[PDB]
Amino acid sequence: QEVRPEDLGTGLLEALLRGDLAGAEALFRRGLRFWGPEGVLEHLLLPVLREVGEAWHRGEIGVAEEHLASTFLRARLQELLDLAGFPPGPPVLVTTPPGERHEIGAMLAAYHLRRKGVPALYLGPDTPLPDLRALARRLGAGAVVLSAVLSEPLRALPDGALKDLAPRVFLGGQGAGPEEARRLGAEYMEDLKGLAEALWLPRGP
Amino acid sequence: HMTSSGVYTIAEVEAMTGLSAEVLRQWERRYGFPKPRRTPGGHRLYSAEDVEALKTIKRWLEEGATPKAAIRRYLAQEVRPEDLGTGLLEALLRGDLAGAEALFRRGLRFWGPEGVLEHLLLPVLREVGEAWHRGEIGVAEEHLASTFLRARLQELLDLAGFPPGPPVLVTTPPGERHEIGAMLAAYHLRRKGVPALYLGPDTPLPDLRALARRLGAGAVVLSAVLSEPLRALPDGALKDLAPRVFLGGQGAGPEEARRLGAEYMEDLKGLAEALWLPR
Amino acid sequence: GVYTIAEVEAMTGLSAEVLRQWERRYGFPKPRRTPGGHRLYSAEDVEALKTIKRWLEEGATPKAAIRRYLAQEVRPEDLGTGLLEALLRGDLAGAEALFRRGLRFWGPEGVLEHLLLPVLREVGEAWHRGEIGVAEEHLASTFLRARLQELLDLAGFPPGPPVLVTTPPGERHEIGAMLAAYHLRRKGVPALYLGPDTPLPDLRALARRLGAGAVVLSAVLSEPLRALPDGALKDLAPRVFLGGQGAGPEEARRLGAEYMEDLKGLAEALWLP
Amino acid sequence: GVYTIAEVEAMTGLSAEVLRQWERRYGFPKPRRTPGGHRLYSAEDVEALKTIKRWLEEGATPKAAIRRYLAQEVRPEDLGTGLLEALLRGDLAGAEALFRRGLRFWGPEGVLEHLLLPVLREVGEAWHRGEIGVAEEHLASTFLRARLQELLDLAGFPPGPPVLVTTPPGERHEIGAMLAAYHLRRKGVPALYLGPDTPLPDLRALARRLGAGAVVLSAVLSEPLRALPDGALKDLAPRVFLGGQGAGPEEARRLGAEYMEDLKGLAEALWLPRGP
DNA sequence: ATGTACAAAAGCTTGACAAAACCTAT
DNA sequence: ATAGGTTTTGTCAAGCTTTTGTACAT
Ligand code: B12
Ligand code: B12
Ligand code: B12
Ligand code: B12
Ligand SMILES: C[C@H]1O[C@@H](n2cnc3c(N)ncnc32)[C@H](O)[C@@H]1O
Ligand SMILES: C[C@H]1O[C@@H](n2cnc3c(N)ncnc32)[C@H](O)[C@@H]1O
Ligand SMILES: C[C@H]1O[C@@H](n2cnc3c(N)ncnc32)[C@H](O)[C@@H]1O
Ligand SMILES: C[C@H]1O[C@@H](n2cnc3c(N)ncnc32)[C@H](O)[C@@H]1O
């Protein structure tokens, strides 16, 4: 009973909503096979997560339903993360700003880095800035990457707060913008694709 | 024979391994291995496991190897059961995920799935919290270690079966962000053939009740690490969530469970068996 | 792990002078350094260099021999070829690593269908063509059996009336039975895997004493089945299932067992009727 | 038979002035006292003091030598009985848990000798007496094999020229081979376990192609060995070892293999070349 | 004949040093 | 692949504590 491409998004959500983890896992493996690792994230993992938030927002599902779906999809992404290689060398620390509890954005950034041979250390979400700076210094981290989904955690930070975290500091996500990034002293990155290559090109150009 | 960890003298080792007594004390000073049990007086007492170990190192040194690497290559292969906890944390603190994953796999094969959680996963997490509390490590270092260990546990969770039938919903009370306790409960349930649906942490009670009703869940399981989230809940708040409601964790107690209308469970082992028997 | 530059020179054949030069103009290998600057190579690097020595002797330059090994993102279909090649050269460490990779991509059930099964079939065919000997097959089969048993033990084992899983007498292919047992455990069925080659009277006696709900038999060869009389499997347990390459619907009916085509519908079949 | 304080002094060598202090310091020996106070040492103590005297001359200390001899207390003996009973009732979970307790206490090598081996022998005897059927044995044997394979994978696998481990053709008992391969790996030897029942020409061909330093064969039954012609094992590998219940020194010489009594000195033997 | 004391033998720790192996560089 | 600076390693010494064999006094 092979289901059509665009029907996988719909089907996966429906499977999760009925508590069929086995069926959901199986549907995800089919997507991974069809579109590959990067592709299944963009076409399957991301659209479902956005719809889940919207569905909750419209009142079609409750918080408990969302939790089940989000925990599942996080587990699949963590699998792919561990599947990728982890090279030697100065690590890149990946997390989210304090107050930011959405972590899946950070995981995606760390995954694309690893796929390009960058030793991205994923810390988890919600890391205090002084502790982050201290860790970056001790491990001799080449860069710090922050995913911001909400804008309020960024607005709460003072000017230049991110400037001295690491030799290079990147900021992205739905909650982040170019104007806001300049104020905090970080480099704005539009998409995940360009981020790994940005680590080779210095500063502006 | 029966006891590998025994007692010997430094003179017996010098006549069994060939290495002089002066060398044995130096390798304990520069490397830490071997580290035999000490008498109340202060004299050494090597074990039989260490005796055969040193006899193996003598072969490598005679085959072309340095004592610094000959010991390090053996410590990785036949590591001490209690050194794995220390080793794993040290590996994590230096950012060596590959080394950490490898050390965990060694533990999994030795203690088994349930075993590795009690004797490796749990003691490391406790020490990490204490180390942070003492100021030895920062929050960022804890995050790295906690995220890693969570990923390993989730892997085991997915490797367990997931049988059909009315699910059991597992989560934590609102305000409770420690989720590893809930995962452990879910895992032990799956290992006993219970379809435990792990939701993640921090689930609002009305939404939890609505989901339990719609899926016809047989029970709800809550893990409370902190006590404050429980204290913030009114009396009988957990009574009507599901046909059976269980509450455990460091933040939970029998007195508090009775007030909230939930059944107190002391240990994870007895939890799966408590589902088969009526309240 | 940790090694010396002298040990590598006696394990790979490459002199110590070369190992330091390739680290200078390529960066590989880059072993962990002692506090004094001394090099400590890992076991993963040791087997790696042993592979590069093969390519250099087969006709390749060190600049490309290393680059092709560094950026070897193995394709999903290259894992089956890779795993077999690793086994045939006696590289258990490399083989185990390749298998864990596949486990994470297709998942527990996925890795069995797309990695474990195709390799076993090809091994039999390769032996049949005369490309490999029996000893080479033995190594590969024992390895893959060990991985499957590991997954079996990682699955849950629920309480309740057990399901006994084995193979008919004379049948020594046991991997088929293990697969059946595994799929059952993944669906919350307490499948007791007995091992292969179990006498029918003893099997019936055990099923009776343990109150087993069902018996499951995997037949790879057809001859063991053909040697059994009519209705031989009828009274083994309340339900008896028979599958495998050596089994068929016509033959199952004669022996008094239910034919099952796929392992997926086996667990479900244990509830509905 | 009991002896005086001077009788044991001649049967061991140690003076009576030392035997009284060993009693008033360590607690051994503890002879029965007459109403007057005379010490009567038992026969179990005379042979015991003769053992310590051999250890003390080897370079040991009384406090350690006596404490070492106190390893006479046998391990939790109910684990063997309990494990078998657990298996016989189909409780895999309970059996796995019982095995893990045995492994932590006696360790890796220890749990094999005191738990894994005794149970396997009793299972065969129980079957032989008709107390259990073949199906019962199968369940137990498959379980214990799984545990051993787990330990095998837990041990490291060093690079270098491999040692091939299997059993002679016709020999289906494979647990003996696994034990040999495990002890080799524990000593840093890259033992490649092939499984049981390997044809000799194929084994020789594999050993040659992999540049294997040695081949190790486990023989539980004697009939598969007797079926082999003279010198059949001679050219399998640079060194060829044979052991197990089915193997003997006389039989090994005929087949052109080196006989090994115990698994312990197998790994030590592969390092240094042995004579004729 | 039960028991304490004393001297010798063996251990343990801090400290240092000369040779072997190794790293980097022209 | 020659050469110089550096780290690692086996060995021993002084100062002193623990342990054990012999004996000393009742
Ligand atoms: C799952 C989820 C949660 C989970 C988080 C689980 C976890 N461990 O991560 C929980 C339950 C904790 C949660 C809580 C909340 N959430 Co929420 N949640 C979501 C949901 C469904 C998905 C989030 C997610 O990870 N999406 C996937 C990410 C990767 O997608 P994306 O951000 O669009 O990413 C793309 C690009 O931005 C880029 N990008 C992302 N990260 C990075 C990083 C870099 C470096 C770069 C270059 C690019 C980049 O990559 C992607 C490419 O397509 C979203 C729905 C949505 N529309 O996003 C709501 C959503 C984000 N949440 C929302 C809300 C309202 C909340 C709460 C405030 C609710 C509450 N009152 O409790 C809290 C806030 C908690 C906090 N303090 O942070 C709102 C946000 C509204 C707003 N922006 O004002 C959303 C949008 C839902 C909605 N209403 O539609 N949430
Ligand atoms: C990792 C971690 C975090 C992570 C959580 C990650 C995650 N996604 O789960 C983060 C960073 C979010 C965090 C935050 C905080 N934490 Co915290 N954290 C820890 C840590 C190191 C481990 C937690 C853990 O999961 N341990 C493993 C669990 C399974 O062990 P256990 O609870 O003892 O479980 C056993 C039994 O209780 C039983 N049990 C557990 N669950 C269940 C369930 C059932 C049904 C049953 C029957 C039994 C049972 O199973 C186990 C058997 O051995 C602990 C250290 C510690 N000592 O626990 C601190 C700790 C729990 N945290 C602590 C603190 C102080 C906090 C913060 C308040 C810090 C802050 N100011 O931000 C916040 C609170 C956030 C919130 N609102 O919940 C303190 C708690 C102090 C107190 N109790 O008053 C601890 C103890 C650290 C310390 N000081 O030693 N924490
Ligand atoms: C490993 C192996 C062995 C090992 C067995 C190791 C062990 N402990 O299991 C050993 C060395 C013992 C061996 C011996 C022999 N084997 Co062999 N062996 C193989 C090999 C390479 C893999 C076997 C295997 O387990 N495959 C994996 C199984 C799971 O795959 P599958 O059967 O196709 O299973 C699928 C479905 O059928 C289903 N299915 C399987 N079981 C079940 C159960 C149920 C309940 C259900 C519903 C479905 C189901 O699940 C799978 C889904 O994809 C095969 C090659 C091959 N093409 O299969 C040869 C093969 C099976 N062997 C073969 C031969 C010739 C022999 C010997 C006769 C050789 C000899 N002369 O000694 C002996 C026979 C011994 C005996 N008396 O049984 C031939 C069979 C030829 C034939 N059918 O006539 C094969 C096909 C090799 C070839 N020529 O291509 N063998
Ligand atoms: C399990 C089992 C089986 C299983 C094998 C499972 C498997 N995959 O290995 C199966 C069901 C296949 C089986 C079949 C048979 N078996 Co059976 N089986 C046993 C059992 C219970 C345990 C075997 C075992 O592995 N024991 C553990 C081994 C490691 O112990 P051990 O040999 O004493 O080993 C020690 C030393 O010898 C040393 N050693 C062992 N290997 C090596 C290797 C080296 C290099 C060195 C240095 C030392 C060494 O290590 C150990 C140290 O303590 C034994 C019982 C028993 N008393 O041994 C019967 C037993 C061996 N089997 C027996 C019989 C009768 C048979 C069958 C003939 C029955 C039949 N008619 O079908 C067949 C023969 C099949 C064949 N062609 O080989 C008899 C043997 C009688 C005899 N010697 O004449 C035994 C003794 C049972 C009994 N009657 O008490 N068997
Ligand atoms: C962004 C996501 O946050 C979840 N969400 C909304 N309110 C809460 C709360 N009080 N606690 C936990 N999760 C919540 C919803 O499920 C939404 O989908
Ligand atoms: C219980 C764990 O909570 C973490 N922790 C403490 N304070 C914060 C904070 N402000 N934000 C995030 N994590 C925090 C510490 O790392 C501790 O180990
Ligand atoms: C099905 C598998 O059986 C193996 N095989 C073939 N003949 C024998 C034999 N005499 N003994 C053991 N294994 C054998 C081959 O390796 C083949 O791959
Ligand atoms: C040595 C072991 O061999 C098993 N055994 C005895 N006869 C057979 C047979 N025909 N088939 C399979 N196993 C058998 C018994 O269970 C015994 O314990």
Domain CATH for A132: 3.40.50.280
Residues with CB under 6 A from ligand 3: C 117, 120-121, 123-125, 128, 141, 170-176, 179-180, 216, 218, 220-221, 241, 243-245, 260, 263, 266
Residues in contact with C164: Cβ distance below 8 Å, sequence separation at least 6, in sequence order:
C191, C192, C194, C203, C206, C207, C210, C212, C214, C215, C216, C237, D135
**One domain, residues A96 and A185:** yes
**Angle ∠(B146,B152,B155) on CA atoms, nearest 5:** 140
Assigned CATH for C156-273: 3.40.50.280
B234 neighbors B257 (Cβ within 8 angstroms): no
What H or E segment, with its residue span, contains residue A145?
Answer: strand A143-147
Tell me which method was used to determine the 3D structure: X-ray
**Residue B22, burial from CB neighbour count under 10 angstroms (0-12, 13-18, 19+):** exposed
**Residue B278, burial from CB neighbour count under 10 angstroms (0-12, 13-18, 19+):** exposed
User: Nearest nt (C1') to B40 (CA)?
Assistant: F18
Reported residue count of chain C is 273
Asked if CATH classification 1.10.1660.10 holds for the domain at D1-74, the reply, yes or no, is yes
| Residues on chain D bordering chain B, Cβ-to-Cβ distance under 8 angstroms | 58-61, 63-64, 67-68, 71, 74-75, 96-97, 100, 103-104, 106-107, 109-110, 113-114, 150-151, 153-156, 158, 186-188, 268, 271
What's the gap in Å between D223 CA and the centre of ligand 7?
Answer: 20
What gap in Å lies between CA A62 and CA D65, rounded to an integer? 71
Strands D258-259 and D239-243: parallel
Residues in contact with B224: Cβ distance below 8 Å, sequence separation at least 6, in sequence order:
B172, B173, B176, B181, B230, B247, B248, B249, B250, B251, B252
Joined together, the tokens standing for residue D273 give: 């070349």
Neighbours of chain C (3+ CB pairs under 8 A): A, B, D
The amino acid at residue D246 is: G
| Residues on chain B bordering chain C, Cβ-to-Cβ distance under 8 angstroms | 64-66, 68-69, 72-73, 76-77, 112-113, 156, 158-165, 190-195, 276
What gap in Å lies between CA C51 and CA C82, rounded to an integer? 13
| Nearest C-alpha neighbor of D175 from the set D124, D251, D127 | D124
Residues in contact with D116: Cβ distance below 8 Å, sequence separation at least 6, in sequence order:
D144, D147, D148
| Nearest C-alpha neighbor of C176 from the set C144, C223, C137 | C144
| Nearest C-alpha neighbor of C168 from the set C258, C243, C238 | C243
B158 alpha-carbon distance from chain centroid: 17
Q: How many C-beta atoms surround the C-beta of residue D36 within 10 A?
A: 5
Joined together, the tokens standing for residue A49 give: 């997560």
What gap in Å lies between CA A18 and CA D2, rounded to an integer? 81
- Shortest distance, CA C190 to any CA of chain B (angstroms): 9
* Strands, E assignment, chain B: 37-38, 44-45, 168-171, 196-200, 219-223, 244-248, 263-264
| Nearest C-alpha neighbor of B187 from the set B67, B95, B69, B271 | B271
Q: How many helices (H) and strands (E) does chain A have?
A: 9, 5
Strands D39-40 and D32-33: antiparallel
Q: How many C-beta atoms surround the C-beta of residue D235 within 10 A?
A: 13
Joined together, the tokens standing for residue B152 give: 């390993």
What gap in Å lies between CA C108 and CA C126, rounded to an integer? 26
Q: Do D199 and C92 touch (CB under 8 A)?
A: no
What H or E segment, with its residue span, contains residue A187?
Answer: strand A187-188
With b meaning 16 or more CB within 10 Å and e meaning fewer, what string describes C124-149? eebbeeeebbbbbbbbbbbbbbbbbb
The amino acid at residue B125 is: L
Q: What is the 3-state secondary structure (H, E, C) of chain D?
A: CCECCCHHHHHHCCCHHHHHHHHCCCCCCCCEECCCCCEEECHHHHHHHHHHHHHHHHHCCHHHHHHHHHHHCCCCCHHHHHHHHHHHCCCHHHHHHHHHHHHHHHHHHHHHHHHHHHHHHHHHHHHHCCCCCHHHHHHHHHHHHHHHHHHHHHCCCCCCCCEEEECCCCCCCCHHHHHHHHHHHHCCCCEEEEECCCCHHHHHHHHHHHCCCEEEEECCCCHHHHCCCCCCCCCCCCEEEEECCCCCHHHHHHHCCEECCCCHHHHHHHHCCCCC
What gap in Å lies between CA B144 and CA A102, rounded to an integer? 16
Fold classification of B157-276 is Rossmann fold (3.40.50)
Joined together, the tokens standing for residue D193 give: 């376990």
Determine which residue's CA is closest to atom 7 belonging to ligand 8: D134
Q: How many C-beta atoms surround the C-beta of residue C78 within 10 A?
A: 13
| Nearest C-alpha neighbor of A79 from the set C74, B197, B107, C106 | C106
Considering the domain delimited by D156-276, tell me its CATH architecture: 3-Layer(aba) Sandwich (3.40)
The amino acid at residue A15 is: A
What gap in Å lies between CA C15 and CA C5, rounded to an integer? 9
Joined together, the tokens standing for residue A140 give: 């001799």
Q: Do A88 and C30 touch (CB under 8 A)?
A: yes
Q: Do D71 and B3 touch (CB under 8 A)?
A: yes
**One domain, residues A101 and A198:** yes
Q: Do D109 and B4 touch (CB under 8 A)?
A: yes
Residue with tokens 């030069």: C21
Strands C163-166 and C191-195: parallel
Joined together, the tokens standing for residue C269 give: 């079949």
Residues in contact with D249: Cβ distance below 8 Å, sequence separation at least 6, in sequence order:
D259
Q: Do C194 and D158 touch (CB under 8 A)?
A: no
- Domain-by-domain residue ranges, chain D? 1-74, 75-155, 156-276
Strand, coil or helix: B274: helix
Q: Do B45 and D59 touch (CB under 8 A)?
A: no
Reported residue count of chain D is 276
Number of domains in chain A: 2
Instruction: Choose one of A41, A69, A84: the last residue of a domain.
Output: A84
Nearest to A29 among C30, C101, C107 (CB): C107
Assess whether the C-beta atom of A172 lies below 6 angstroms from ligand 1.
yes
What gap in Å lies between CA B209 and CA B206, rounded to an integer? 5
Closest residue to F20 (CA to C1') is D62
Joined together, the tokens standing for residue A6 give: 């665009």
Residues in contact with C91: Cβ distance below 8 Å, sequence separation at least 6, in sequence order:
C47
**Is C38 annotated as contributing to ligand binding?**
no
| Nearest C-alpha neighbor of D150 from the set B100, C146, B152 | C146
What gap in Å lies between CA B84 and CA C177, rounded to an integer? 36
Strand, coil or helix: A116: coil
Determine which residue's CA is closest to atom 37 belonging to ligand 2: B249
Q: Which atom of ligand 5 is nearest to the CA of A52?
A: 18
| Phi, psi dihedrals of residue C228, rounded to the nearest 5° | -85, 140
| Nearest C-alpha neighbor of B155 from the set B101, B203, B192, B194 | B101
| Nearest C-alpha neighbor of A179 from the set A169, A191, A188, A190 | A188
What H or E segment, with its residue span, contains residue C94?
Answer: helix C92-111
Tell me: cis bond preceding A97? Omega within 30 of 0 counts.
no
Q: How many C-beta atoms surround the C-beta of residue B265 within 10 A?
A: 20
Spanning CA of C133 to C1' of E4, the rounded length in angstroms is 79
User: Nearest nt (C1') to B23 (CA)?
Assistant: F10
Residue C42's Cβ-side half-sphere holds a number of Cα atoms within 13 Å equal to: 16
Spanning CA of B41 to C1' of E5, the rounded length in angstroms is 20
Enumerate long-range contacts of C50-56, CB under 8 Å, 24 or more apart.
C50/C11, C50/C12, C50/D159, C53/C12, C53/C13, C53/C14
What's the gap in Å between C140 CA and the centre of ligand 3?
Answer: 13
Strands C214-218 and D39-40: unpaired
Joined together, the tokens standing for residue D101 give: 């307790």
Assess whether the C-beta atom of D169 lies below 6 angstroms from ligand 4.
no
Asked if CATH classification 1.10.1240.10 holds for the domain at C75-155, the reply, yes or no, is yes
Q: Which atom of ligand 5 is nearest to the CA of A64?
A: 16
A106 alpha-carbon distance from chain centroid: 3
The amino acid at residue C88 is: L
In angstroms, what CA-CA distances link D64 with B22, C146, D26, D59?
20, 43, 10, 11
C107 phi-psi bin (left φ>0, alpha ψ -120 to 50, beta other): left
CA-nearest residue of chain D to C148?
D146
What H or E segment, with its residue span, contains residue C33?
Answer: strand C32-33
Strands B219-223 and B168-171: parallel
A144 neighbors A118 (Cβ within 8 angstroms): no
What's the gap in Å between C164 CA and the centre of ligand 3?
Answer: 20
First-residue to last-residue Cα distance in chain D: 45
In angstroms, what CA-CA distances link C188 with B28, C112, C152, C184?
51, 19, 12, 7
Residue with tokens 């607690």: D27
Residue with tokens 């890259």: D190
What gap in Å lies between CA C169 and CA C184, rounded to an integer? 22
Q: How many C-beta atoms surround the C-beta of residue C171 within 10 A?
A: 24
Assess whether the C-beta atom of D81 lies below 6 angstroms from ligand 4.
no
Joined together, the tokens standing for residue D92 give: 């895999």
What gap in Å lies between CA C245 and CA C218, rounded to an integer? 9
| Nearest C-alpha neighbor of B233 from the set B268, B200, B273, B205 | B205
Helix C117-129, helix C78-88: angle, nearest 10: 60
Residues in contact with B148: Cβ distance below 8 Å, sequence separation at least 6, in sequence order:
B92, B97, B100
Strand partners, C32: C40
**One domain, residues A142 and A184:** yes
| Nearest C-alpha neighbor of D142 from the set D163, D157, D127, D120 | D120
What gap in Å lies between CA B134 and CA B212, rounded to an integer? 41
B181 neighbors B252 (Cβ within 8 angstroms): no
What gap in Å lies between CA A184 and CA D60, rounded to an integer? 71
Domain that holds residue A183: 85-205
